[PDB]
Amino acid sequence: LRIAALNALAACNYLPQSREKIIAALFKALNSTNSELQEAGEACMRKFLEGATIEVDQIHTHMRPLLMMLGDYRSLTLNVVNRLTSVTRLFPNSFNDKFCDQMMQHLRKWMEVVVITHKGGNEMKICSAIINLFHLIPAAPQTLVKPLLEVVMKTERAMLIEAGSPFREPLIKFLTRHPSQTVELFMMEATLNDPQWSRMFMSFLKHKDARPLRDVLAANPNRFITLLLPSTSTMRLDLQFQAIKIISI
Secondary structure, X not given: OHHHHHHHHHOOOOOOOOHHHHHHHHHHHHOOOOHHHHHHHHHHHHHHHOOOOOOHHHHHHHHHHHHHHOOOHHHOOHHHHHHHHHHHHHOHHHOOHHHHHHHHHHHHHHHHHHHHHHHHOOHHHHHHHHHHHHOXXXXXXXXXXXXXXXXXXXXXXXXXXXXXXXXXXXXXXXXXXXXXXXXXXXXXXXHHHOHHHHHHHHHHHOOXXXXXXXXXXXXXXXXXXXXXXXXXXXXXXXXXXXXXXXXXX
16 A cells, blocks of 8 residues: 555656655655565655656755665665665666775674684675675775675685675676776786685686676787786796686686
8 A cells, every 4th residue: 555655646647736745755765664665665756756857955864864874884784875876776877986995894893703604604795785885876886896805705715705796796786887997806917826816816707797797808819918928937837727718707
């Protein structure tokens, strides 16, 4: 009933007198702890925006209670991250670089909590959703790639998981947004020698969505020619093997 009422209300996008009340109701539904009501709020807001504008001040005022609450990392429940995801999908401008830095800090703390829980034996879903949030914020800088890769590698190494890791699916979405930065970070000599990073690079390159990364690598074949061979000799043969594996992919 609430969803049907919200859908009927969002259809009144053309009445200029109504808009403030409708926008308030849509933001209330978009922030609902109920999952179905949250999704309905997102869909109704998307429909409402097709025929009505909404100001940035309205978005900030309506989202202020949630943004103030997420100052601490324990406040980031899966519902809160879902609401932030919906807000950044509807209103990409809303979130800036400092929000990305705060989300990075919270993600680091939640990954530490995931590692602690694994050592002792929803936090994995919180972590995955937080990683997924980054690629939907247009203001997310390429400088996030290195800390994000470092924290994911640390968590996976602690948990000893590669195939079952749920961090790869959102991370590859973020990496494909900055493919040159990712390729240059992984194609460093020390990083190509470090077997864990080389494995993570090969796994990312094999992904279906990793076409931008492979296109970036393919655009400069001359990079491989330095790695094809002209205790140091052990490193050069490893670099040649990594090069031939990348070319094979």
